[PDB]
Amino acid sequence: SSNAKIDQLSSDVQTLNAKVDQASNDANAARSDAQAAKDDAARANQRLDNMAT
Amino acid sequence: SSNAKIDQLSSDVQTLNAKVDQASNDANAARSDAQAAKDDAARANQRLDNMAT
Amino acid sequence: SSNAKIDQLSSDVQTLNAKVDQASNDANAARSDAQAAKDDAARANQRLDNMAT
């Protein structure tokens, strides 16, 4: 049914919106965590580099 | 065409579902990897902190 | 309205496509950054491991 199909698509879209917003949250969180870790690892390696002296 | 437009939207939705599920996989993987790296960098810095003594 | 609802869904889909592509970019970037950080932290810990000797 045309109306039935439109209604199913409306629900599908809402479900996708929720999934999409959640994927972004996870991605932004990951972007953040990765940035912090990359900096902290860079810091540990700098400290090691200065160890010879 | 109404039916034609509905059919195109149905296909678009399916494509988005696949893209959405893939973005979540990448995000969750990244969240995991970042957590592990942040911990490992934190560990390296702790070991360095204890180096003075 | 059937046509009105179809038009709203078309716009919703386009918005989701943009959000979906952006979430993937963030996720892939995060995957990359996390990989680099995990390697750099692993490197710092290896260097520390060799410190005893």
Curated annotation (Swiss-Prot), chains A, B, C:
Disruption phenotype: Double lpp-ompA mutants are spherical and only grow in the presence of electrolytes such as 30 mM Mg(2+), and are sensitive to hydrophobic antibiotics and detergents. The peptidoglycan layer is no longer attached to the cell outer membrane which undergoes abundant blebbing. GO terms for molecular function: identical protein binding; lipid binding; peptidoglycan binding. It is found in: Cell outer membrane; Secreted, Cell wall. It comes from the Bacteria. Belongs to the Lpp family. The keyword Cytoplasm does not apply. About one-third of Lpp is covalently bound to peptidoglycan. Its main location: membrane. An outer membrane lipoprotein that controls the distance between the inner and outer membranes; adding residues to Lpp increases the width of the periplasm. The only protein known to be covalently linked to the peptidoglycan network (PGN). Also non-covalently binds the PGN. The link between the cell outer membrane and PGN contributes to the maintenance of the structural and functional integrity of the cell envelope, and maintains the correct distance between the PGN and the outer membrane. The lineage of its organism: Bacteria, Pseudomonadati, Pseudomonadota, Gammaproteobacteria, Enterobacterales. Keywords: Cell outer membrane, Cell wall, Coiled coil, Formylation, Lipoprotein, Membrane, Palmitate, Peptidoglycan-anchor, Repeat, Secreted, Signal. The gene is lpp. It is a lipid-anchor; Peptidoglycan-anchor. Sequence repeats lie at residues 3-13, 17-27. One of its GO terms (cellular component) is extracellular region. Residues 6-53 form a coiled coil. GO terms for biological process: lipid modification; periplasmic space organization. This is Major outer membrane lipoprotein Lpp. Homotrimer. Interacts with OmpA. Has been isolated from outer membrane preparations as an approximately 87 kDa complex, suggesting it also forms larger complexes. Seems to interact with TolB, Pal and TonB. In pull-down experiments interacts with CedA.
